[model samples]
Target: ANKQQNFNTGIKDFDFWLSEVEALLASEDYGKDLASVNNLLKKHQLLEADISAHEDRLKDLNSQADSLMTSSAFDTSQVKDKRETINGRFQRIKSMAAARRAKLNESHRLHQFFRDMDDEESWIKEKKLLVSSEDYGRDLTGVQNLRKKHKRLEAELAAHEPAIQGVLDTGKKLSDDNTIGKEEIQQRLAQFVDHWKELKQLAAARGQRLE
Candidate 1:
């Protein structure tokens, strides 16, 4: 039995990753390492909240669909025809939700990778700051080793950046594929469903289906 519901599972997926991004951005090493980590983390955190709120709204819409479907004096037989119409609206929302989630997740992943690289850079900065301190006597070998490590980290970061950017681009394409106008179409479809229900009620009162 296919349950008729409009909850945006795609949005839910995005919400999960958004939380992950927030956690990573808030990590101890992250805060102490990257210079701009705090600001970037705050921005992503706000976006995560927005995605979560949208998911909640979609859930409410699903709940409303359920309520209307089972409302007073409504029979399954009569409601069957309207199922596809309602489902179409759900599909449109799902498409947009999926696109948004995919794009956000890709962006988050890419940003996180960059942030990790930034953390390494910050570590290098911290080491340089320490080496320049008055306490720095003659740890030439240790400093050389730190330089080598920094080079390796920098190389790794550079190597992965293009791949991550490609993913981000793909996500952007998905997000752009379905514009907001499609969502308006979905909203109008929902309104049509409501109108349909009213007509059904009127027909029931008159002892005939509206033809």
Candidate 2:
């Protein structure tokens, strides 16, 4: 249904609204810009919570499916019905979740865009100010500091390569039946399971939770 026949008029009004918003946002301190940022952070946190909860729900459901596969309670007739029910639940949850996730992602992207732009602009302005006010020695020191930070990051990344390779090799071996015997595979899987448990514990220790 066409709510407005005067589309051009509506567009003009919309443009005006956007212009007003742009002017307001362009202004330093929206009277409570920090508050607005906090509010956005809270919203992002809530969306993250919803996504994490759903992920955990899916993990639990998968675990239930695995348990059913091994359980004597999962008779053929009951298993079929149970499987159908789980699949339907998962499909519904996932389908609805996609839209919610898209919305959340868009919000996150917009927030991050604003944040990064703000930071970069501020950084550039500060750099310009420093160059104008400070001596060349200060500038050289800043460059050195940045170089050290970059080198530290590179070293940290290099240190993680062995763990990454272990994961890759294990994945490749798991994909090939002949690469490892059943007992060897079981032992390897146990190691991975232990690692996962350890990671979960590590996350917990850091006041974080894993699905």
Candidate 3:
């Protein structure tokens, strides 16, 4: 409704809006940090909205030109050219916005994955200390408590095993796609795998000691 009223002002309004959009599309740093990437995403999302809004307006104006082709003094040449240039600018903006969103999404996923890796590494380290504990207990009740503690440890590992495997699976996917520094991710994967291998061996030996 508001746009209908505004259309009486003609293509000048579109030019004004187009200038503004061009300004908005100006170069940006949009650093790789999660916060920075997130902020840029919000801006890109808004740009997408504006592009869609005017897309309808441009098409509507272009349609009227088709209807007015028979009317003299109105001229179709400039109308046709404006339609071409406007659509081209809008299309260019759409492609740029799409590419920026993809890069931001990739960075977002990789940063979160790194954070997950840190958390998993921390958990594995803490568990390794417990699993490799030297204490066996001195009495019946003492041994009983140790046995239950060991049982709890085993169950914890059983539950957490899924998470460990899940991260590795994701790292593999990310690496296979050659995203977010594929060689770096692969190197981290090797280290994480090595840590898990040692943890697995230590847990088994401790189980034998407990028996």
Candidate 4:
């Protein structure tokens, strides 16, 4: 009767372990590791199958243990060992998954910085296009209007310099840790800023000559 009780206790222990494993597997928060999340899931499924097989074997033997003492000596050591192994594997994968999530977020932020820089470039190009098409050099009124437009655009672009530099520094650092070619983006931003400065100098000189 005591031996039968031990078998029942063993079954309960196995059920508890299985429940913990199931909970971990069902968790939705581990989806960040696109490179390895699927592989981890596959491994978890295999581990679950092993646990189920062991649980089923124990259930089958429990009934026989009720009738014979020889059958009561069922070994549950293998199941316990497997449970520990699975737990360790889960922890390792969980850590990796978190790291993957962080990297993805950093990548997204870097891309956004590049997009903002590109928008500024477009603003500069549009202003230049408008100026280039105008006959501002032919009349005093046209020259005054062009000077005002140039001053406004130059101030706008100057105001954005600090923000641009901030993004450039951060993107460069992030690029060191990743392979997203942020250096190229940085170079483009630098070139745009330099070109804009040249345009500002030309506009300033032209306005002075008109005066």
On lDDT, the leading prediction is 3
* Clash totals, every prediction: 0, 0, 0, 0
Model 1: residues >4 Å from true position, as ranges?
1-81, 130-211
TM-score of each: 0.27, 0.24, 0.59, 0.48
TM-score, candidate number 1? 0.27
Query: What lDDT score is found at residue 61 in candidate 1?
Result: 50
Q: Which ten residues in a row have the lowest lDDT in candidate 3?
A: 1-10
Candidate 2, 1-211: lDDT as tens digits: 2212232343344335334433432322211234465564565456446545555554554455455556564354544454455456545544544544454444444344334434534433443332232222246666566445444544543464455455546444544533212343455445554544443343333222111
What digit string (tens of lDDT, one per residue) describes model 3 on residues 1-211?
A: 3332333355677778877877776655444556777787787788788788888888876665455554575555766676677778877777766766676677678767777898899999999998878988887888788888888888888888889899989998887765335655777789998888888788878877777
lDDT, candidate 4, 61-126, per-residue tens: 445343444343666555445445544544554554455445445555555556666776676676
Q: What are the lDDT scores of the predictions, listed in order?
A: 0.45, 0.43, 0.75, 0.57
For model 3, what is the C-alpha lDDT against the true structure?
0.75
List the pairs of residues colliding in candidate 2: none
Q: Give the range where candidate 2 is weakest over 10 consecutive residues by summed lDDT.
A: 202-211
Question: Tens digit of lDDT per residue, candidate 1, span 101-167?
Answer: 4544444443454454445445435433433333212477755655554455446545745644453
What lDDT score is found at residue 3 in candidate 3?
36
Arrange candidates by lDDT, descending.
Answer: 3, 4, 1, 2
Best of the two (2, 3) by TM-score = 3
Candidates ranked, most accurate by TM-score first: 3, 4, 1, 2
